[PDB]
């Protein structure tokens, strides 16, 4: 299991790396590398993380020439997994950065939520269609994905707004919450990603 975490930013990425190293301790031949450049060989698991502005980080990925890389992993049917900001990048554009578009690996857009307390922040309950454990995860985000049912993976409500907290387009996975901050079930989820990303 060759695991890659894009480390360029913005935001804290060492939490996820440490959480991913924790969740992977009981798996044979795990390597976790922090990727800033294109590598010649591909990863089994590539994580796109990040916390911040949609526009930046779509900047930091194009600047370091990682869109090529990321899209190669998609075609070579590896497992590509975005978390917080990284999940949002998987879609076409966002209200956070107008003219700026990104990755477009999944058909959809990102929009600000409708709540007047809009750092959505704390433990909220995710319910999955399949695979990943249902329970409370830790969110800290202001923007949500807008996508069509078939690509929804997990659904959570914040202030009367049902929204996709997890997404899936094949071997593309995205999670809106931070599983590094999600305690036992955060590790359970991460292991399930590593498992999914094993067999091929």
């Amino acid at each position: 299991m060759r695991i890659g975490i894009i480390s360029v930013g913005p935001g804290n990425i060492m939490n996820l790396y440490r959480g991913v190293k924790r969740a992977s301790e009981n798996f044979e031949d795990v390597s976790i590398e922090l990727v800033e450049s294109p590598r010649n060989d591909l990863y089994d698991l590539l994580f796109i993380p990040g916390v911040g502005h949609f526009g930046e980080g779509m900047r930091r990925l194009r600047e370091n020439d990682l869109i090529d890389f990321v899209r190669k992993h998609v075609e070579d049917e590896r497992y590509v997994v975005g978390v917080c900001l990284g999940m949002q990048l998987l879609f076409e554009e966002s209200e956070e950065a107008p003219g700026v578009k990104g990755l477009s690996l999944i058909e959809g857009n990102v929009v600000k939520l409708r709540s007047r307390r809009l750092p959505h922040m704390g433990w909220n309950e995710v319910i999955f269609k399949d695979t990943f454990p249902n329970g409370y995860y830790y969110f800290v985000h202001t923007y949500r994905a807008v996508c069509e049912e078939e690509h929804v993976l997990g659904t959570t409500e914040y202030d009367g707004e049902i929204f996709p907290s997890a997404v899936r387009k094949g071997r593309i996975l995205g999670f809106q919450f931070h599983p590094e901050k999600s305690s036992k079930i955060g590790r359970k989820l991460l292991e399930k990603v590593i498992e999914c990303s094993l067999s091929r």
């Binding site: 959480g19 433990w123 329970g135 409370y136 914040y158 901050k181 305690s183 036992k184 955060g186």
Partner: protein
């Protein structure tokens, strides 16, 4: 809906957990990282490390605690206690802390709130508010409950949300050291004045005090006292609150 949180308060001096009241009998209660892991192990939702390291070594010691915690913990933690300016808070957040808590420095400079929020988002900023009853008014105190600021709690909480704070940490000075339960009247008082999540602090002793705190409108309930020295089982408490209507975060 969002879960009500149970938060563990670790008091730390010189990268160590302190137990006591006065520093005559402040004794070592262990490693904060190990202790924080135990709080996560048993189901505590957030952690809060408040540091009372002597002024000379405070800044260095606080950065070491965050890194040592950040390298092993899997739940949000807040660090606070003696954080007087933006870049001190910048250091701590980039070193691993999810939220920084300010009090004295936020009263003496409301601008400091918006600074951290502008660069790190509101979610990064906890405002501690120590408040006490003084001649029938709820007053804000600083310098660890020792200076009357002449600011009404009612006006401060509004300003604090106005400055882009993400969360209020509300300690009742008349209730610290007490085990008779949270100051629910003060929580009730603050509740209609803000939309920020309220963290009740000061007074906990039995399960039902948490039910009282959450009834009174707290979004989370802080507590050091109880969880170690296995008085209140955290999962026990979480089931108890679930039973009587509180939307807790429960794990199968």
């Amino acid at each position: 809906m969002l879960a009500k949180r149970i938060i563990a308060c670790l008091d730390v001096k010189d990268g160590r957990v302190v137990k006591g009241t006065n520093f005559e009998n402040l004794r070592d209660s262990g490693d904060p990282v190990e202790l924080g892991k135990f709080y996560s192990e048993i189901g505590i939702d957030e952690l809060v490390f408040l540091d009372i390291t002597a002024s000379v070594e405070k800044r260095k010691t606080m950065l070491e605690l965050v890194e040592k915690v950040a390298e092993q913990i899997d739940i949000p933690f807040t660090v606070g206690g003696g954080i007087h300016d933006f870049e001190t808070a910048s250091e701590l957040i980039l070193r691993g802390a999810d939220k920084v808590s300010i009090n004295t420095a936020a009263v003496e400079n409301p601008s400091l709130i918006t600074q951290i929020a502008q660069t790190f988002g509101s979610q990064a900023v906890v405002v501690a508010i120590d408040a006490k009853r003084v001649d029938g008014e709820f007053m804000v105190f600083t310098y660890s409950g020792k200076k009357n600021t002449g600011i009404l709690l009612r006006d401060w909480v509004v300003e604090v949300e106005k400055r882009g704070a993400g969360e209020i940490l509300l300690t009742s000075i008349d209730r610290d050291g007490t085990k008779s339960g949270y100051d629910t009247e003060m929580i009730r008082f603050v509740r209609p004045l803000t939309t920020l999540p309220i963290i009740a602090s000061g007074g906990a002793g039995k399960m039902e005090h948490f039910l009282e705190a959450f009834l009174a409108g707290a979004d989370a309930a802080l507590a050091a006292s109880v969880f170690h020295f296995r008085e209140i089982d955290v999962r026990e408490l979480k089931e108890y609150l679930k039973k009587h209507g509180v939307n807790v975060r429960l794990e199968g």
